[PDB]
Design a protein around this nucleic acid. Structure first.
Lengths: 97, 106, 82, 95, 95, 109, 80, 98
DNA sequence: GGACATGCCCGGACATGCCCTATATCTGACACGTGCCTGGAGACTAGGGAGTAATCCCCTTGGCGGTTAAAACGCGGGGGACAGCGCGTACGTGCGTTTAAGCGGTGCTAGAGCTGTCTACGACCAATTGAGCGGCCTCGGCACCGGATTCTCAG
DNA sequence: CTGAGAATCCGGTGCCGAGGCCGCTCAATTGGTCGTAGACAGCTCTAGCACCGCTTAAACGCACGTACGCGCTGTCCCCCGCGTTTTAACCGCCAAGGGGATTACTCCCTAGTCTCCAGGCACGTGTCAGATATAGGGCATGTCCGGGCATGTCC
């Protein structure tokens, strides 16, 4: 049957998700992860809805920006595929690693 | 009759409220009469600039109501506003539709 | 006690995040590093949020605590209070 | 009946001044309030530090003006200083 | 005879003699120590003031200072500093 | 009148409780300041000074130097993970940098 | 004027060596000069702004220390 | 034939030499002339304290050394050794200065 | 050598379904009316920090030169940057499944939020003195220089 | 393996600035008084947590094709190292001036308090632009069909 060329659908998805504003991380697993990490900081914590939404907005913005920088570093090396070493370089140059 | 300092100045942000917020912010033991007027005036100016650009972006999008996306477009498209807000994340703002040239097909 | 919730951050979610970041192709090995990075972010942000909560004699992390934590980490977030 | 603090009516008046045909959503209003409060805190803090560094105990318009020049970019700083000076001069004459 | 200029030089020297009785200090290094102490002072006092403001608190206490130290200092450093501060404050209160 | 003794001595500290208290009062941080806040602050400042000076002394003796110089302070700060984190955005004058060569730059046999 | 040439090729090489680089392209020097110049424009701007606010005619070391601090890189050893 | 080291040995020697010490590497007077020149473009007839120029010089060298560290790391990431302008531009772009 | 029939490749029409444009419904979220009361506005008082004038000295600006380490230039070269090609392998893309993500309704109680009292706690001022800072001496840790020792390298 | 260049240590000699001492000085201390605010109780009331139910979009695993990261090879070019010439950096030394900081005098500007008022904020309510949904035009892109070319084979 019909099959799209490698790259066209990836670009279509990039345009799609950069045009819109809905959150891309699932609510319930993000909340579960946040709560799991929290048990080791303070017991039986309760979290407001707007607090979990705040953590999710911050996390998605941070990851999107990090992926932007990672993509720029990969393309700089005449590559297209992002590597773990790309993430590590981006975070080291940003100064958190 | 009572007439406010904003009315005498022809400005929209409240001189009294900015003055009270300065007095209660534990910033200094005295505050001059002109300082909150100046600060309020700068805030009107910056608000007018941001709302101007966001309205423009909304009209380009055939929208009559400004949304966070339009605010993000306004802040990131204007060179000086992006610099001023270089370390600021606007929620539900998204990113600019920017694609690197080398990634485009041949 | 929630256990192994790190597996809830799925591969397609990280792929979508990369798409929004402009990434066209993603190695299979990317995911564990991304998960680690995400985890690191959470341990720092939540630590500050909970610290504020405990100072305020509260047991519920508030939206303002998180926004303030983000601000004091330089990643100020708009939309949940100033 | 818990009174809060927002600039909603003033933002709406300025918007109607610049564009008397556009509205604003709740999320967008929250973003505008966060923005204005953030700028306020930044400018007031820099002015406070400026005054302390110079052994000044009063918040006057010169520290505000200098802080604006430090924080705002080129054209933004020039336009803001011009508007602030004209407005303060008109108020001072109006008393 | 110039104006009164405050510094931590004598206190840095006393701590140094406690920890290293036979070690000296150069003027450049002492200046670096003074810059360091003043910077930490500014960070801690500012964060404590902000913490107190956020919670509608009008009094500077030891809880905001300790919490600010925990926010700014790393893990084991925070634990040791908190332990020292609590012992010191309780001993002072005994007097 | 009772003999005058300072709060720093009462607390077993070297940094001046009175001076830190005055700087807190005059730093435009709040209208009111507790008695224990400057004690706590002095204790944290003394602790950080003792650890940095300890490490700098160690580096100085490793270099067979008896006088602490900025180089030793920079080495001490950068050789400690927690101090390096705390001072991640601080440049020490006359401090130099840590000796470090990436493996790819070394010669090969 | 011509004074940008006073930061000579061996000076950029020495700074780069302390930065740990083993080889330096010929196209590096102008780039470094541009970066350095931009940095100076921003720093000196803030310093002179502070100097003028104090009603002074000479930029002091403390003016520079405040400029560097507000730029996001605190400099130790010159007061404060 | 006269002695000659292979490319790199002397480079490493100067790296070790200048990373061991802390004495300044950029010339004082040309930098001073540059700073005063750049400054008249903001305010004419400006003066500079000696310790002010030394502070600016210390700051500049620390900034350049850090930037060159990051540039070197980016070059090594690309399985390269020689740094080029695009490396500088990537380092400054990722840092958020551009 | 001439005729025949097809294999194969390339150009164009086209199937698929993606983008774009138009419109009905509603609905809940955005825009406007109200009460009031607390923050804002007008006015008098005080006091202290800011504006302004005179000094000085020290801190900066300006100038000559030498001479030497650094800067500029010439040139051999070799090794690293860069272009081209193989590969295979791990990743983009399609499809069935289930797995849980997401929405609607209800529990209720832990916990966030508002108010009453007052007593410990901190602001504020007089007298004091002892810790803290400016100035001077000096000698010892550090800096400069010369030489033998050791490290390292490339032929 | 070994000569040569460079880093290192040991020793001698100088040197200059930090540590100690002394005099001055000003703010920390002690004492007391009085505003005040936040700790604790108590009441209210909000939504966070959990559960249940259902529907449906996404994850996942697998199959399959395929595009480029990496490795290898070839090329070349242009920066590193060394030698030669230059030149200004820096220390040394000396004049001069100007303004940062200090001290004194004045003055005027805002905290504080009082009194009155008005507009901004829950609450409520109207109402309308976009989310959701369905349908129609038009076109990008990989795909398949038809036509033309070319070389193989038989008479």
């Amino acid at each position: 049957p019909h099959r799209y060329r490698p790259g066209t659908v990836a670009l279509r998805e990039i345009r799609r998700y950069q045009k819109s504003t809905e959150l891309l991380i699932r609510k319930l697993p993000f909340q579960r992860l946040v709560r799991e990490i929290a048990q080791d900081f303070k017991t039986d914590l309760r979290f407001q809805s707007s607090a979990v939404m705040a953590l999710q907005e911050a996390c998605e913005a941070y990851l999107v920006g990090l992926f932007e920088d990672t993509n720029l570093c990969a393309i700089h090396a005449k590559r297209v595929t992002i590597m773990p070493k790309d993430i590590q370089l981006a975070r080291r140059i940003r100064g958190e690693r | 009759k009572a007439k406010t300092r904003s009315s005498r100045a022809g400005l929209q942000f409240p001189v009294g409220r900015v003055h009270r917020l300065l007095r209660k912010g534990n910033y200094s033991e005295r505050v001059g009469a002109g300082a909150p007027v100046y600060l309020a005036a700068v805030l009107e100016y910056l608000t007018a600039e941001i709302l101007e650009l966001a309205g423009n972006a909304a009209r380009d999008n055939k929208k009559t109501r400004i949304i966070p996306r339009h605010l993000q477009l306004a802040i990131r498209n204007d060179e000086e506003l992006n610099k001023l807000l270089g370390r600021v994340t606007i929620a539900q703002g998204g990113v600019l539709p920017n694609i690197q040239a080398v990634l485009l097909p041949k | 006690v929630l256990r192994d919730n790190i597996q809830g951050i799925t591969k397609p979610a990280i792929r979508r995040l990369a798409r929004r970041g402009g990434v066209k192709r993603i190695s299979g090995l990317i995911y564990e590093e991304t998960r680690g990075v995400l985890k690191v972010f959470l341990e720092n942000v939540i630590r500050d949020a909970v610290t504020y909560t405990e100072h305020a004699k509260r047991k519920t992390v508030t939206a303002m605590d998180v926004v303030y934590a983000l601000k004091r980490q330089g990643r100020t977030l708009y939309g949940f209070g100033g | 009946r818990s009174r809060k603090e927002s600039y909603s009516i003033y933002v709406y008046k300025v918007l109607k001044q610049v564009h008397p045909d556009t509205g604003i959503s709740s999320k967008a209003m929250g973003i505008m309030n966060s923005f204005v409060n953030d700028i306020f805190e930044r400018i007031a803090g820099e002015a406070s530090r400026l005054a302390h560094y110079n052994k000044r105990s009063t918040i006057t318009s010169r520290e505000i003006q200098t802080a604006v020049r430090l924080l705002l970019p080129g054209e933004l700083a020039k336009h803001a200083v011009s508007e602030g000076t004209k407005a303060v001069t008109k108020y001072t004459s109006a008393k």
